[PDB]
Amino acid sequence: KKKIRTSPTFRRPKTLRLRRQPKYPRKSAPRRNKLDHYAIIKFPLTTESAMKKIEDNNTLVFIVDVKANKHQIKQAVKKLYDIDVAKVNTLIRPDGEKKAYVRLAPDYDALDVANKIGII
Amino acid sequence: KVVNPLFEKRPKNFGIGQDIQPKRDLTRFVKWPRYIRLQRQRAILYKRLKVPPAINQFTQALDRQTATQLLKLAHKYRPETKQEKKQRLLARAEKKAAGKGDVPTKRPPVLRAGVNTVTTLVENKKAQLVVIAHDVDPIELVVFLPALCRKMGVPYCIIKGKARLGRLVHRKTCTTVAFTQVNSEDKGALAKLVEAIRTNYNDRYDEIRRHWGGNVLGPKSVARIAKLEKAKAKELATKLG
Amino acid sequence: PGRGAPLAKVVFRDPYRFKKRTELFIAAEGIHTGQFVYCGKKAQLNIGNV
RNA sequence: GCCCUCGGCCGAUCGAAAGGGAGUCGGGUUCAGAUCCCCGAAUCCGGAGUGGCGGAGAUGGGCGCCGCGAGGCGUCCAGUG
RNA sequence: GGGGCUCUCGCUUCUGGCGCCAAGCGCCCGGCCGCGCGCCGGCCGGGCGCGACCCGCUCCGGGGACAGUGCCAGGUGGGG
Ligand SMILES: [K+]
Ligand SMILES: [K+]
Ligand SMILES: [K+]
Ligand SMILES: [Mg+2]
Ligand SMILES: [Mg+2]
Ligand SMILES: [Mg+2]
Ligand SMILES: [Mg+2]
Ligand SMILES: [Mg+2]
Ligand SMILES: [Mg+2]
């Protein structure tokens, strides 16, 4: 006495949808991250402009993987050089490589970091 | 006496152009899915169209009383399922080993199911009572059975529900079931069923052959026709006498 | 545009839900904005009524 | 998680570096880059569960009393400017 | 009085307003103290029905064994 239809439209009733519970993983193991931080940072630039950035703007110039973004470049430089960076500016060179201008934090100096990196 | 004076009725009238209509039932006016429309229009078509008696005979099914006593008798002769057949076989194997061996033990009467199994029993005169479902959806598997049962002389009845016959044989659907020989304490009950079945189906098979179905118009068509029949009869009556 | 006949925008009340229905009637000559037009079997003979 | 209730962009999607579309400007700097770098002033959007600080809401009247008065206690009534 | 009997078996027209997510009534189901004798004192919540009549086989209306479609037959056919 209560099954009522106040609408002249029939809609498909909502039926529950089960979450996948596979009996075997399709791939046996997850593939390791190929874009690790050693892959992100390839080599630093040592041109005259790169040297000018180090002792003017406290900035390290790097050649990075083209698929790495600013967040990934920021983390990569932080762990394998133990420095803190302020911001990362990124461009893709006409030759196809990606170049990152990594400005260090004020408490870090880009000159001694470049000295211990080995790109003086 | 203590009723708060602020309470009062606020009736809303649902006349045309006034307060919006209430959420009333619209089931009759629903845009239904095509599968619902198809099966409802199929039912109406069977009512409109001339239904040949060979197809219309299945509309005449057993009454609720007689169906109950028939299924009640048929429940005493259900085919055994997979579980107790194993128990029967395991008991037979151990009894065979120690030490009777064969021990036929008078294989009990059982209900025979399936249209192919039953039709061979009817042709062989070995069926005592045939029960046919009324809603065999591909209605060619059983259109011949009522005539075949009549000629062979075996009493036959039509029951509502192939699912009920299916539940009788532990399956989803059974088209027909047949009564082979029956136990002595059930012979009287089977006899009470046969003569009533035989009066309603075998004895009046001649006018079952000629009883067409359908050919009934829709209520709107009937009502307006009846309105016209009443429309002039209200002055023909004044005309006469 | 492309029609040499003015169109009248007429707003009705939806009889079944709380909403306003907007129609695009072809304007009969003499009807003006702010006029009430009445549509139905029981509407009376006036310019614009349906 | 399920149930009840409510729920028509009534049509996926694509389609503009001149249409719509929030919010960056001034100065300096290179051999070649800048409204993007540096310096200095802003600004938009998004986020803050444990709530970051303030301010608003919001903090007044009535009656019994104490108290010279001012000011205090109890109760009742307000209070989405 | 009034029934076979007819229209109604109706709630909207002077205004460039507003109008939904039920008031009301009835029947109940929980918790509270408690007359402490049960339909029984009163307080917080929840449900159903009438409000919003019943029944029914095509959503409503217009055509309709025609139109139309398939195959063949005759005519027309520098449009090709
Ligand atoms: K654009
Ligand atoms: K031709
Ligand atoms: K031609
Ligand atoms: Mg799967
Ligand atoms: Mg860029
Ligand atoms: Mg929709
Ligand atoms: Mg696009
Ligand atoms: Mg230039
Ligand atoms: Mg030619």
UniProtKB/Swiss-Prot annotation, chain A:
Skewed-composition ranges (Basic residues): 1-31
GO terms of molecular function: cadherin binding; RNA binding; rRNA binding; structural constituent of ribosome; TORC2 complex binding
PTM-bearing positions, type N6-acetyllysine: K34
Keyword match Ubl conjugation: yes
Mod. after translation: N-terminus is methylated by METTL11A/NTM1. Citrullinated by PADI4.
GO cellular component, one term: cytosolic ribosome
Signal peptide: none
Residues where Citrulline is found: R5
Spans annotated as Beta-like import receptor binding (BIB) domain: 1-38
Residues modified to Phosphoserine: S7
Main location, first listed in the record: cytoplasm
Domain of life: Eukaryota
Subcellular location: Cytoplasm; Nucleus
Swiss-Prot/TrEMBL keywords: Acetylation, Citrullination, Cytoplasm, Isopeptide bond, Methylation, Nucleus, Phosphoprotein, Ribonucleoprotein, Ribosomal protein, RNA-binding, rRNA-binding, Ubl conjugation
Induction: May be down-regulated by GNL2 (at protein level).
Residues with the Phosphothreonine modification: T9
GO terms, biological process: cytoplasmic translation; translation
Similarity field: Belongs to the universal ribosomal protein uL23 family.
Comment text on domains: The N-terminal beta-like import receptor binding (BIB) domain mediates interaction with IPO5, IPO7, KPNB1 and TNPO1.
Subunit and interaction comment: Component of the large ribosomal subunit. Interacts with LYAR and GNL2. Interacts with MDM2; this interaction may promote MDM2-mediated p53/TP53 polyubiquitination. Directly interacts (via BIB domain) with IPO5, IPO7, KPNB1 and TNPO1; these interactions are involved in RPL23A nuclear import for the assembly of ribosomal subunits. Interacts with IPO8.
Function: Component of the large ribosomal subunit. The ribosome is a large ribonucleoprotein complex responsible for the synthesis of proteins in the cell. Binds a specific region on the 26S rRNA. May promote p53/TP53 degradation possibly through the stimulation of MDM2-mediated TP53 polyubiquitination.
Name of the protein: Large ribosomal subunit protein uL23
Native source organism of the sequence: Homo sapiens
Taxonomic path: Eukaryota, Metazoa, Chordata, Craniata, Vertebrata
From Swiss-Prot, chain B:
Keywords attached to this entry: Acetylation, Chromosomal rearrangement, Cytoplasm, Isopeptide bond, Ribonucleoprotein, Ribosomal protein, Ubl conjugation
Pfam family, one: Ribosomal_L7Ae
Record keyword Cytoplasm present: yes
An example Gene Ontology biological process: cytoplasmic translation
Localization in the cell: Cytoplasm
Annotated positions of the N6-acetyllysine modification: K9, K72, K192
Key word Isomerase present: no
Residues joined by cross-link Glycyl lysine isopeptide (Lys-Gly) (interchain with G-Cter in SUMO2): K23, K72, K100, K220
Any one GO MF annotation of this record: structural constituent of ribosome
Source organism superkingdom: Eukaryota
Function: Component of the large ribosomal subunit. The ribosome is a large ribonucleoprotein complex responsible for the synthesis of proteins in the cell.
Family stated for the protein in its record: Belongs to the eukaryotic ribosomal protein eL8 family.
Disease the record associates with this protein: Chromosomal recombination involving RPL7A activates the receptor kinase domain of the TRK oncogene.
Protein name per UniProt: Large ribosomal subunit protein eL8
Gene from which the chain derives: RPL7A
From Swiss-Prot, chain C:
Intrachain disulfide bonds: none
Superkingdom, natural source: Eukaryota
Record PTM: The modification is impaired by hypoxia.
Annotated localization: Cytoplasm
Secretion signal span: none
Role played: Component of the large ribosomal subunit. The ribosome is a large ribonucleoprotein complex responsible for the synthesis of proteins in the cell.
Misc note: This protein can be partially incorporated into E.coli polysomes in vivo, indicating it can replace the endogenous protein.
Family classification: Belongs to the universal ribosomal protein uL2 family.
Subunit composition and interactions: Component of the large ribosomal subunit. Interacts with CRY1.
Name used for this protein in its record: Large ribosomal subunit protein uL2
Lineage: Eukaryota, Metazoa, Chordata, Craniata, Vertebrata
Gene: RPL8
Parent sequence residues shown: 52 to 101 of 257
